[PDB]
Design a protein around this ligand. Structure first.
Ligand SMILES: Nc1nc(=O)c2cc(CCCCc3ccc(C(=O)N[C@@H](CCC(=O)O)C(=O)O)s3)[nH]c2[nH]1
Ligand SMILES: NCC(=O)N[C@@H]1O[C@H](COP(=O)([O-])[O-])[C@@H](O)[C@H]1O
Length: 201
């Protein structure tokens, strides 16, 4: 399965995916990395790994649909099968989501359905949970509401900040995102007719 990874910053999840997809038994290969932000460290990581990169800024497009179409063009160019959102901090439009239904994965740093949105760690700390975690899910039109593939719980320590908590949760992210990509790319897991997750094996 040919994979595109979309990023907006540091790219630690990208690096974990690059590492995993180069294992001999990997069913996925990363053929393109796309960023909406220029000069971010995730681009350096891709380049260093010998993977092509494309930057697409919102300032060159009228609306969200034309922005996504520019993404889609590149996806089609590289004959992509699966899209991974790895620190990609943009909402995707309906038709784009619909086109890639069952083919697009996102990593989110909470145990969904808790703490949806762009500041999950802030929410978890504000709420005072002692257990948080991360979630890989299929992307549906409603944000962070798509079908869940894998999750991993991560403890919150007293005195945790966004800095220390996100560091701990990222170690879990780097485990389940490669595991989830491998499940989907090997055809072991799929979105299924009724919409709910289907373990084909
Ligand atoms: N259709 C859809 N379903 C999803 O399940 C899903 C997950 C993501 C992944 C992202 C979800 C977290 C985010 C929530 C809100 C954000 C936001 O408003 N981003 C700005 C970017 C501005 C900037 O920082 O430069 C924007 O969209 O314009 S980012 N994107 C998705 N889109
Ligand atoms: N809602 C999306 C979201 O909050 N994504 C989060 O952004 C970080 C990106 O780190 P990275 O650039 O080092 O992979 C990750 O922690 C990811 O879970």
């Amino acid at each position: 399965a040919r994979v595109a990874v979309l990023i907006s910053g540091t790219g630690s999840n990208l690096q974990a995916l690059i590492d995993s997809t180069r294992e001999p038994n990997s069913s996925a290969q990363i053929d393109i990395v796309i960023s909406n932000k220029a000069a971010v460290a995730g681009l350096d990581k891709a380049e260093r790994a010998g993977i092509p990169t494309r930057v697409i800024n919102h300032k060159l497009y009228k609306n969200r649909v034309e922005f996504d179409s520019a993404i889609d063009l590149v996806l089609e160019e590289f004959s992509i099968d699966i899209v991974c959102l790895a620190g990609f901090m943009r909402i995707l439009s309906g038709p784009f989501v619909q086109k890639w239904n069952g083919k697009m994965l996102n990593i989110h740093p909470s145990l969904l359905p808790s703490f949806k949105g762009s500041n999950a760690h802030e929410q978890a700390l504000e709420t005072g949970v002692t257990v948080t975690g991360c979630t890989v899910h299929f992307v549906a039109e409603d944000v962070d509401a798509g079908q869940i593939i894998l999750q991993e719980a991560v403890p919150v320590k007293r005195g945790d900040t966004v800095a220390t908590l996100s560091e701990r949760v990222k170690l879990a992210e780097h485990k389940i995102f490669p595991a989830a990509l491998q499940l989907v790319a090997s055809g072991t897991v799929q979105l299924g007719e009724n919409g709910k997750i289907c373990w084909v094996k």
